[PDB]
Amino acid sequence: QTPCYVVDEALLERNLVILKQVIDRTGCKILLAQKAFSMFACYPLIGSYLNGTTASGLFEARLGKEEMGGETHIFSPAYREDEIDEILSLCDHVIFNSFSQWEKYKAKVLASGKSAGLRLNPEHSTQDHAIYDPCSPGSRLGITLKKFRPDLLDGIEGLHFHTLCEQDAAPLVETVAVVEEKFGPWLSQMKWLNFGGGHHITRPGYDIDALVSCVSRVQERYGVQVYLEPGEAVALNAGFLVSTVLDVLENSGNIAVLDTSAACHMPDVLEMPYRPPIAGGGGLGEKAYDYRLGGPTCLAGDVIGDYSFDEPLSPGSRVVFCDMAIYSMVKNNTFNGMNLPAIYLKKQDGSIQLVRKFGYEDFKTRLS
């Protein structure tokens, strides 16, 4: 039933096998960063390879704890007073964004017996786009060296940084060196260090050996447990969005109206923007027929992209978008009243299971 997301266990496992290689070669631990991928029907499988999850807040922490188990970590720029108690009941590692946050909650943390950390801002930008870079000037994420309070570290057991996105090992090695240069005197006393996410570990060509060497050296030098918390890497190229063509019309070219919406079902396509891969689809002029693919919404701008195909698209044709497991289901919406796509799981044995199908009530309940 289209439109629908389909996550493929075999493709998830291809990614998880690589992450497990890193664990086994280093003794580090690896957590799923749920913000990228929170499809909890897959959490048991993921938890059979990884050590647990990390979270951006109470809801992700509860989902990780209840649906995966393992370790349950959390970081937030600022915790809510009305949630800190439940967070401490669920999480085994809790990361604070500032010394004001740490001092506010320190007494509760100590009483809970859970392990507290601080997020550091090493002020070493390696990302291309500064708007997305947690090290850019004025960032609200992590504590910069000039703001660091060595006199307030009693009770802190870990330090954390997250500064990368879709990056190879070299920027991590470089950032670790900056963390050592700036915060080195306080690393030995920690029980754990967390290198964050953004590590493109499962992208072909990633320098696994350099990551392994860096993780191992840090663990040995400082006597710490290193954590990595990739999100995208877990589910990269492991899911699809299947859509059916509803109508084809001509207006200065061929237009196909699909039963999936970019605005509702893959919003990053419009917001970034970026062009999703389509199986059998090429660039404009590369195959015999050019089409502009648009959504079934009333939105002039809900245009998925321009693609070519070797044969015509017709009503009833199926179009398969790729790399649709990440940063999709976690942030989709019911704008224009479009029904949410169903969620399917293609199992290791080739069978397909319907996980979740949505309807009117899911749209209505958000509005009053």
């Binding site: 996105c165 879709e166 970026y274 999703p276 389509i278 059998g280 790729c322 940063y327």
Partner: peptide
């Protein structure tokens, strides 16, 4: 950003 490496 977060969609650099999709493949068929």
């Amino acid at each position: 950003h977060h969609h650099s490496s999709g493949l068929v």
